[PDB]
Amino acid sequence: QSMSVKGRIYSILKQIGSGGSSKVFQVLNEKKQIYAIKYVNLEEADNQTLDSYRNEIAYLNKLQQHSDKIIRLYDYEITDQYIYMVMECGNIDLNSWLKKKKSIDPWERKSYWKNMLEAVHTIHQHGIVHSDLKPANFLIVDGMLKLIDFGIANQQVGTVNYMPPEAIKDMKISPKSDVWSLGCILYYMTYGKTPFQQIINQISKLHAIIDPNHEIEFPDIPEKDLQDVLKCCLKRDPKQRISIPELLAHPYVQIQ
Ligand SMILES: CCc1cccc(CC)c1NC(=O)c1ccn2c1CCc1cnc(Nc3ccc(N4CCN(C)CC4)cc3OC)nc1-2
Ligand code: NA
Questions:
Q1: Within a 10 A sphere around the Cβ of 151, how many other Cβ atoms?
Q2: Of the listed 68, 105, 132, 211, which one is catalytic?
Q3: DSSP class of residue 70?
Q4: Most buried in the list 4, 63, 143, 154, measured by CB within 10 Å?
Q5: What are the backbone dihedrals phi and psi of residue 240, each rounded to the nearest 5 degrees, phi first?
C-alpha cells in the first residue's frame, strides 16, 4: 500500500527492519526515487521515551551537515500518534553482510574501519557516546559504511559481545567505551568471531570481559598493524585504551 509524509506520497516496496513498535520500509516516491522510511508507533510511549526519540531525531538532523558517514535523513513527520522518517536507503546492514561472508578483502575491511571511525568520531565531537555499537548499527551504502543511530532513543538485541568492561562494572561511560565496541567489530571482521564468542554462558562471558587474568587471543596474521589496532582497542582499562583521534593517525588506516 502507501504512505504520506509532509504531503508527499510513498509507495511501499517491502519491509527491511523491525524494533518493538517501529518498522523500516523500502519505498518509492512520486519521482520513482527509492528511500527508506522508518515508522514509529507512539501510542504506548511514556514522556521520557518520547523525549529520547525527539532528542535522537534532533541530533540526526543536526549532524547531517557534519559528516557524510552518518545516514541521510531527508524529511520527517511527527505527531502524537506516530513518527515517519524519510531516510537514505542502504544496500544492506553490516551485520547481515558479514553473516553471509566467508572472508573479507583486507582493503574492504580497512575502508569500512575508516568509515566507522569517522562516523563515531563525529558523534563524539557533539558530546554523544553511543555505548551500544554493534555491526547492526552500520549501513552499507554505495560501498560505504554509515552510522544509522546514536544510541539515544530508548531500546542481536541486548547482545553482550560488544560490551566494554566499564559498562559491566557500573552496577563510567566515556568515548573510550565506543572504542572497545569498535574493536570488537574489527576483531570480528578480522578473525570471524567476537573476542568472547566462545563462552556460551552469559554470566561467564560477563566475568571473562572484566577479568584481567583472562587473556584475549590475537592469532598472528599478515597485517601486523591490524593486530596492533585490535590490541590497542581491547585494553580493559579505558585510560590505557587508544582514543579515536589516535586511531585515525594509526598506520593501519594511513599507510598505503
Ligand atoms: C540498529 C538501528 C536501529 C535502532 C533502533 C531502531 C531501529 C529501527 C528498527 C534501528 N534500525 C534502523 O533504523 C534500520 C534498520 C535498517 N535500516 C534502518 C535505518 C534505515 C535503513 C536504510 N536502508 C536500509 N537498507 C537495508 C538494510 C538491510 C537490508 N536487509 C537485506 C535483506 N536481509 C534479509 C536483511 C535486511 C536491506 C536493506 O535495504 C534493501 N536499512 C535501514
Ligand atoms: Na537509537
A1: 15
A2: 132
A3: B
A4: 63
A5: -90, -10
Method in brief: X-ray
Ligand 2 center to 151 CA (angstroms): 4
> Cβ(252)–Cβ(226) under 8 Å?
yes
**182-to-58, 188, 215, 231, 252 alpha-carbon distances in Å:** 24, 10, 19, 12, 14
Using CB atoms within 10 Å of the CB of residue 120, give its burial: 0 to 12 exposed, 13 to 18 middle, 19+ buried.
Answer: buried
Every domain of the chain and the residues it spans: 3-91, 92-256
Protein residue whose Cα sits closest to atom 14 of ligand 1: 17
92-256: which CATH topology? Transferase(Phosphotransferase); domain 1 (1.10.510)
Instruction: Report CA(115)–ligand 2 centroid distance (Å).
Output: 19
Residue pointed to by grid coordinates 532513543: 153
- Resolution of the structure in the document, Å: 2.3
Chain gaps in the chain, named by the residue before each (C–N > 2.5 Å): 155, 171
The number of angstroms, rounded, from the C-alpha of 146 to the middle of its chain's C-alpha atoms is 8
Q: What is the rounded CA–CA span in Å between residue 135 and residue 154?
A: 19
**Active-site residue 132, yes or no?**
yes
